[PDB]
Design an enzyme around this catalytic site. Structure first.
Site, PDB file in Angstrom:
ATOM      1  N   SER A   1       0.789  -1.238   0.000  1.00 18.89           N
ATOM      2  CA  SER A   1       0.000   0.000   0.000  1.00 18.89           C
ATOM      3  C   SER A   1       0.814   1.277   0.000  1.00 18.89           C
ATOM      4  CB  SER A   1      -0.890   0.059   1.239  1.00 18.89           C
ATOM      5  OG  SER A   1      -2.010  -0.810   1.086  1.00 18.89           O
TER       6      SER A   1
ATOM      7  N   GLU B   1      -4.245  -7.938  -6.221  1.00 20.73           N
ATOM      8  CA  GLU B   1      -3.141  -8.672  -6.878  1.00 20.73           C
ATOM      9  C   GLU B   1      -1.741  -8.141  -6.550  1.00 20.73           C
ATOM     10  OE1 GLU B   1      -6.048  -7.867  -8.392  1.00 20.73           O
ATOM     11  OE2 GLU B   1      -6.889  -9.810  -8.937  1.00 20.73           O
TER      12      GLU B   1
HETATM   13  C1  LIG Z   1      -1.942  -2.084   1.558  1.00 23.38           C
HETATM   14  O1  LIG Z   1      -0.675  -2.711   1.976  1.00 23.38           O
HETATM   15  C2  LIG Z   1      -3.019  -2.860   1.975  1.00 23.38           C
HETATM   16  N1  LIG Z   1      -2.632  -4.265   2.347  1.00 23.38           N
HETATM   17  C3  LIG Z   1      -3.537  -2.060   3.230  1.00 23.38           C
HETATM   18  N2  LIG Z   1      -2.380  -1.500   3.938  1.00 23.38           N
HETATM   19  C4  LIG Z   1      -1.999  -2.232   5.153  1.00 23.38           C
HETATM   20  C5  LIG Z   1      -1.158  -1.263   5.980  1.00 23.38           C
HETATM   21  O2  LIG Z   1      -1.365  -0.194   5.684  1.00 23.38           O
HETATM   22  O3  LIG Z   1      -0.387  -1.637   6.798  1.00 23.38           O
HETATM   23  C6  LIG Z   1      -3.287  -2.632   5.884  1.00 23.38           C
HETATM   24  C7  LIG Z   1      -3.821  -1.402   6.616  1.00 23.38           C
HETATM   25  C8  LIG Z   1      -3.019  -3.828   6.821  1.00 23.38           C
HETATM   26  S1  LIG Z   1      -4.431  -3.026   4.477  1.00 23.38           S
END
Ligand SMILES: *C(=O)[C@@H](N)[C@@H]1N[C@@H](C(=O)O)C(C)(C)S1
Length: 265
Positions: free
Chosen positions: A42, A142
């Site tokens: 993310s 993905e």
């Molecule tokens: C992006 O990595 C997506 N998996 C979201 N981001 C993570 C993070 O920000 O640590 C979450 C909040 C676990 S979900």
């Protein structure tokens, strides 16, 4: 010695760790596996919001975006609650950064537009900032699933730190758009047990996290000393040894950050 400390943490967490802090006035760059590829996860949402801001007039923030049941395919704490009403571009940027909302980021990619549902334009935005290393190839879910070693959807601690530096500290964005991005990252809700946990309370910390499969845990931050001296901190990790379901370990990033903060104090 820092490299010894980072290597100890790798053994402790059965992890691969990458760290970059760009050089400043009086501090040498800090670097550990800084040029190895790690999955964005993310963390790409920080430059993504910068791209959308840069690409449009500021009042594009007020444009209503509508979406449906079938757009919800990833962790989306905010967008799940607004399928009927839609969400403005501003609201989508807010969710993408502060809650790491996956649906929000997918919609922002589509707003940016062009081939690959916006992944190519996103990658083009990074190219415009001199980043010839990073690439985004897929959207959520993905983008978090590429096998360890695969180059799809990766950046490096070095590449992402230089990008964040230009976005927050440099002139990639006009002051008004820059402040919007900075404020969202300052108000992030997902970052408390990562880089933030490694710096003393009187240091300001703004950040964007990422988490993925194969025990992936990332955090990119800009920090300011109690006297207003800023540093960019990129920490990235995975645990390929636990396979696809390896648990991400935030503590590793907290400890790495503590080590960095020790050098910067
Ligand atoms: C992006 O990595 C997506 N998996 C979201 N981001 C993570 C993070 O920000 O640590 C979450 C909040 C676990 S979900």
């Amino acid at each position: 010695d820092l490299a010894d400390r980072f290597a100890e943490l790798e053994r402790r967490y059965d992890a691969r760790l990458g760290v970059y802090v760009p050089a400043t006035g009086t501090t040498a760059a800090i670097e550990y596996r800084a040029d190895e590829r790690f999955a964005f996860c993310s963390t790409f949402k920080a430059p993504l919001v910068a791209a959308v801001l840069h690409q449009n007039p500021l009042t594009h923030l007020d444009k209503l975006i509508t979406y449906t049941s079938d757009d919800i395919r990833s962790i989306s704490p905010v967008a799940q609650q607004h399928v009927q009403t839609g969400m403005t571009i501003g609201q989508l940027c807010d969710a993408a950064i502060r809650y790491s909302d996956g649906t929000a980021a997918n919609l922002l990619l589509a707003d940016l537009g062009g081939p690959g549902g916006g992944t190519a334009a996103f990658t083009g935005y990074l190219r415009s900032l001199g980043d010839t290393v990073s690439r985004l190839d897929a959207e959520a879910p993905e983008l978090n699933r590429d096998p360890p070693g695969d180059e799809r959807d990766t950046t490096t601690p070095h590449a992402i730190a230089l990008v964040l530096q230009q976005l927050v500290l440099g002139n990639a964005l006009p002051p008004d758009k820059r402040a919007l991005l900075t404020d969202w990252m300052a108000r992030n809700t997902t970052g408390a047990k990562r880089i933030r946990a490694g710096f003393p309370a009187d240091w300001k910390v703004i950040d964007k996290t990422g988490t993925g499969d194969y025990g992936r845990a990332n955090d990119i931050a800009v920090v300011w000393s109690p006297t207003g001296v800023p540093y960019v901190v990129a920490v990235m990790s995975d645990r390929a040894g636990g396979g696809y379901d390896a648990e991400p370990r935030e503590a590793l990033l907290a400890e790495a950050a503590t080590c960095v903060a020790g050098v910067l104090a």
